[PDB]
């Protein structure tokens, strides 16, 4: 199993980082991508790949911090980009459940950084969260120009998720669907996506299972509980664990171009 969506950067792990990273690979997790947010959270990313073994990492500027988008940026991210420890351009997309950036530089932001993949011939690790129609309106003219995309902590409908699928894009599924309050449609379509389209995550430390038996007192996500999601995912769509997880590893070999 792989985890595509961990935000190691955050300060909740600055205290253990180590030990949440042994602690993961010592569960039967095999790689991390480390999720880089903005161009210092980018650039902090890479240096905790370099630090622990089958770690990578994204270099982009996330929807919430699109308003730091300036002309220096681009060139910023390439200089990342280029290292072998960064393998997808992100996390970038759009986010209109709220208004921490204007939509107007979200979305320019976003542009920005599918240009970006075009150039450097690089996946894109999306976000996409109450804007599903903008969203494919923007990807339409760059998608066909890159390897390959990942709509990860995907939370969206059934018709959204065959409408990403039948354009090669990645479903990111987290722990959300193990939430019994808003959880229901999401698990519902989970036997819908396509094998080869899944992508299993955390986004530690967010979304931590209220499925988990038992509770942490802290409540903090991490990928030590990658394992939890991945059977309830399998349980859910009539899957043998160790069969999905082969499938969702090649799936991560197969878009980013790593091993492990």
């Not at 988008?69 to 709220?98: H, Y």
């Not at 939509?103 to 976003?110: K, L």
């Not at 990807?139 to 059934?158: I, N, Q, S, Y």
């Not at 349980?235 to 969702?248: S, V």
Request: proline letters at 5%; aromatic letters at 8%; hydrophobic letters at 40%.
């Amino acid at each position: 199993m792989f985890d595509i969506g961990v935000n190691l950067t955050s300060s909740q792990f600055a205290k253990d980082r180590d030990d949440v990273v042994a602690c993961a690979f010592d569960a039967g997790v095999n790689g991390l991508l480390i999720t880089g947010t903005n161009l210092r959270e980018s650039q902090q990313a890479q240096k905790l790949a370099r630090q622990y073994s089958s770690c990578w990492s994204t270099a982009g500027v996330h929807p919430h911090d699109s308003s730091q988008w300036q002309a220096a940026t681009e060139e910023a991210i390439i200089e990342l980009a280029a290292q072998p420890e960064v393998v997808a351009i992100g996390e970038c997309g759009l986010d209109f459940n709220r208004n921490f950036s204007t939509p107007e530089e979200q979305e320019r932001a976003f542009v920005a950084q599918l240009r970006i993949a075009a150039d450097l011939n690089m996946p894109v690790f999306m976000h996409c969260r109450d804007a599903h129609e903008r969203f494919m309106t923007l990807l339409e003219p760059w998608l066909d120009k890159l390897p390959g995309a990942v709509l990860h902590c995907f939370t969206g409908t059934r018709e959204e998720m065959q409408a990403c699928v039948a354009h090669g894009i990645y479903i990111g599924i987290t722990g959300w669907v193990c939430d019994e309050r808003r959880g229901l449609e999401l698990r519902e379509l989970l036997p819908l996506i396509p094998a080869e389209k899944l992508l299993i995550e955390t986004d530690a430390p967010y979304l931590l299972p209220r499925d988990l038996t038992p509770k942490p007192s802290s409540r903090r996500n991490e990928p030590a509980h990658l394992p939890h999601i991945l059977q309830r995912i399998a349980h859910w769509r009539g899957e043998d664990a160790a069969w999905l997880a082969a499938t969702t590893d090649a799936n991560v070999k197969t878009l980013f171009g790593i091993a492990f």
